[PDB]
Amino acid sequence: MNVIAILNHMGVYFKEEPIRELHRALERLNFQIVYPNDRDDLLKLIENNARLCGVIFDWDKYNLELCEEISKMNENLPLYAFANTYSTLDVSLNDLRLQISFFEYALGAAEDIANKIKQTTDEYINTILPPLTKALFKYVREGKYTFCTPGHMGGTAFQKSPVGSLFYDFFGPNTMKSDISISVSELGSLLDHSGPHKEAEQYIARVFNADRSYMVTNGTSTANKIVGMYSAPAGSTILIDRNCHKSLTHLMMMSDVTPIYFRPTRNAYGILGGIPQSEFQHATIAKRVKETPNATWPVHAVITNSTYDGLLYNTDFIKKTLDVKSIHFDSAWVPYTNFSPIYEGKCGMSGGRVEGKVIYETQSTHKLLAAFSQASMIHVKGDVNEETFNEAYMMHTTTSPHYGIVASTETAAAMMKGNAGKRLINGSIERAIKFRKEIKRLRTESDGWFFDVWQPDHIDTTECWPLRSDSTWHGFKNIDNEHMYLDPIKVTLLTPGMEKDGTMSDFGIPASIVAKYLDEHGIVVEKTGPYNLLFLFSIGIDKTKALSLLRALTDFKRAFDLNLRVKNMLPSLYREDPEFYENMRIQELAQNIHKLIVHHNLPDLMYRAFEVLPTMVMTPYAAFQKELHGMTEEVYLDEMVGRINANMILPYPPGVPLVMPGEMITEESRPVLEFLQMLCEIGAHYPGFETDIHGAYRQADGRYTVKVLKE
Template sequence: MNIIAIMNHVEALFKKVPVKELQAQLESKGFQVVYPEDEQDLIKLIENNARICGVIFDWDTYSMDLCKTVNSLNEKLPLFTFANEQSTLDISLTDLRLNISYFEYTLSSAADISVKIKQAVDAYKDAILPPLTKALFKYAEEGKYTFCTPGHMSGTAFNKSPAGSIFYDFYGANTFKADISISMPELGSLLDHSGPHKEAEEYIARTFNADRSYIVTNGTSTANKIVGMYSAPAGSTVLVDRNCHKSLTHLMMMSDVTPIYFRPTRNAYGILGGIPQSEFTKSVIAEKVAATPGATMPNYAVVTNSTYDGLFYNTKFIKDTLETKYIHFDSAWVPYTNFNPIYEGKCGMSGEAMPGRVFYETQSTHKLLAAFSQASMIHVKGDIEEESFNEAFMMHTSTSPQYGIVASAEISAAMMRGNSGKRLIQESIDRAIRFRKEIKRLRTEADSWFFDVWQPENIDKTECWKLDPKDNWHGFKDIDDEHMYLDPIKVTILTPGMTENGELAETGIPASIVSKFLDEHGIVVEKTGPYNMLFLFSIGIDKPKAMQLLRALTEFKRGYDLNLTIKNMLPSLYAEDPSFYKDMRIQELALGIHKLTAQYKLPELMFKAFDVLPEMKLTPHAAWQEELRGNIEEVPLSDMVDRISANMILPYPPGVPLVLPGEMVTDASRPVLDFLEMLCEIGKHYPGFETDIHGVYQHEDGSATVKVIKA
């Protein structure tokens, strides 16, 4: 961060001499000087270059209007203005709060002015850096000799080995200087929340509108277990979203609790839908408790918000209706909701605290904000017993946390503060909407077919679009009004193969084929369904990335229409089994997989598989204990009807369980098994299209087995 922008008018007005003197002084202090042509050029420069650390301009030319425009982008950015003695500084008390320094044009004053500018820039850097990161940087700069862990000693050990030196050079010196022991008192402790760690958590809580926040260094999978361990003691009953992440199943395997499930929905595409409003009512919950052996009225509930595919709930309705003391919103995929008004009322930290209630929001900071992998946060609104909560926190937290992960979580919060953070999120939303409209435009101009987008017809208004019961685009049956909303930045692209009524067409292009083509072109899809692909337009997506995706999609259409060979169009797939794919063409492959999907009646499967859930015969905890005792056996997947599953079974991604430990697939819930068999069958027939299914063991001979409790 070392670029100073000097407006060109300043240079021209005073025949360059004073400004050239200033430029030389600034460059001697390590600054790079650039000259925007005009105000519009300056604004673009600030928007596209985060390393701008100051703007110098002429007051008589630009005055307060420029200051306010820059302030709307970054209210902390230092502004330096030159004014003659005759200039009138027509500013109000409010204007004086802006970050402006005033200088006069004089020769031979450049050295003094450059010192003042450097001081202002240093103060700017200090103001935008959060507390723990600042302390960590300071520690790394001091270069202390340590005789404690970690053993690489700021990277010294790596440089004693040829392999280690390559590793060191790849990551750079500061990575290892900042990888330190918890023994450093000046940095406090993540485990007892002291010193800069405590300041960091307080800073994060203020940023995310929480009463209390915790930094978690092993992802939201761990954050979910921490919250559940505290909120649901052994012997209690928990309400769990059936579309939960597998980490919550692991929580129920670890803790002796009885689950009852919110009934989920899916559409024909397999897109995860919401929980109907009726499921949150006391009467429906009481019926489920009465029908579940050993269950009592629950005090802890978990809701996935948003869903993997970007559907938000009206969280105010859930808070007002659901009577549990603890409501846990697993918001792994949406850590940005506090920074744009379109998400108000759709996230866990929206609104005020409610007496006697506790709301949690667990967020994967690394997923859609800028943080290292595994950086996660727990946000709390309401009163918790902090010492007891911290015991649950420490059960799942290493006594040797990686400080780089901790600092990256904190810096992601710093990036979201103020106008610059709001601008980042707004730009993501705007870019996603432009991309959606471009797909629609190309579809209308296409001579035969093109991809579509899962969204309502009218997306001109920037908002989270409501799933209206009167509309057909979303494909969900009997949904509630004012309940579910689509996030603009979660873009689901639809491939041909399904009609508007959710039925399979005569022909189709399975999305897995398109995903493989995109991967060949350096584009990784977040999630691939039968005829849909999910793309996340996070703050790291820029215009070139979006354009490259558009180009790759049009290239796929061109290759498909030409009916190119697999060898030419998908060389990596061809390499999986050259003899099988010899002379096969892309349309033949698409039709073959599409026919297998039709054979299993996919749309009907998607609805039926979640209408009737497998029956719980043992709690997940009890089933896991049976497995640990060795009381299990392996049987063919097709033989698991009327057998109690020992493991959870789920296709990944999205990592949402279809069968939980202790559950039995019956004839009534047979569609769940049919869906799993369809996935296995596609992988068996077409090399390279195997689905990673947790809990299903696929063997070289094409068979698939599962573990069940011995009869």
């Protein structure tokens, strides 16, 4: 905030020489001065920037509707109207409700005007800032010597070493002084929820429409642990989504709990869809309790809302009909929910306080909002035992947190209050929708093949487009109406190779080549399956990045039709093994990997492997207990049927836990083994496209091993 914009030169002297004196005084007060030519120049200057902290304009040539337009753009922005001809009498109430401060044109009075402008800018900065970030900035500005942890003590240890000086010159001084610990008593403490921290969690609670809100400093991988260790005591039972994270599996291995796994649907692409409506009612839950050993009525439920590919649920249905005392939504990919009414009825915090149960939501703030990594939140909705749940939160977090992460966690919510946050969210959603409309437009504009995007055939409104059973763009057969809602900002491109009914085509490009090409040209894809990409259109995405992406896709199309060699187009993949990719064209490589997928029948195996659940011999807690006692042997992959698995098997494709720790592959679940063997067989042909299975360990001969339990 040092940019203060003065409107145009009227022409007469008595209201220009005071303006030039105020210009000189403001430059003396370390303010950059910009000179927009007219009104629309000011509108564009304010929307394209954010460092602007003041507008000076004459109240004669520009009326007070150029206070209201800026108010629609930013409510808290100070503007400085200069009163010459309009008297006191010419002011309405709507002018008085805006951030304007009136001044006069007097020669030699520029010093007091500049001091008042500096004070107003300071008030604006101290108004828009959240309280803990405000206090941290104040503490760094009054920077005191310290004799406490951390050891760098304001980064003055990095000023006395060469590699330390490189680190210090990279990061800069303010992010070294911002790292302090709980010994600084004026900032309170995260662990005890005191002072500026307590004001911060109350601020987070207002913003996100939650009763009590927490600010985790390790991540939602730890927030899931906190929620599932509070609400699910040992010996109890949980309803965990099979579409889960590794963190929930880790939680189940720490705690002595027992699962019933929900059964999500999926298409031939490998996109993890959702649980049908039948598996949230009392009948199916009671049945699955009945045929699970050592199982009682579930006391907690964990649901991934949304999925990895951005499929929201009808959460009002869930909160009405799921008859458990605590429903947890692992909303790691949807933290931005409250800030656009598009997502109404699509999160745990949507709607009011539900009766008889506590709704948890564990937004991963760093993922889609603007926050530093390892930042997360736990929003609750209901009544919880305050000391027990506070102690459970204290149990998993560290004792001396990184205050940069905490300040970023709060500043992410502070970016969403007012009109600026609504403008951010609506701009991101509208930009995502416009990108979707041209990618379907360029599909019908181009010749031959082009990238498809997995979205409804007619989208033109800003809403979460519901997945209807009467349409076939999604691919989930016999899907329930109003249970799924596509998130517009998680754009999933598609590549040729798949037909609409689910069978495979002949000409195709698997998405690994497209992702590697985009990585070569300096744009990064989130994660790819066999024939899909994913692009997070968060609040950071502007039209520069969107156009560069669209124009990396087009250059890939041109380079693939021209059929350039692997050496020229993909040097990063060429360097994987130059002997192999020396005389190979890209069309031959794409055709070869596509034929390896087709002949081995990848999508049918990937479907039929996840439509059958492995037999739960013992709870994953018992599997971890037997793993700790050294009762694990590494049998080869083929002889794994009838054996209890000790470590989780997580195959890419698709990215969802296939075999849990403690489950047996029986003869009824042989397509699981066939899929694993097929994936190992196809991954050992072409370098750079190596097999990515978390749990299976590569040997030298080419056959993988899985840690199973001894007999």
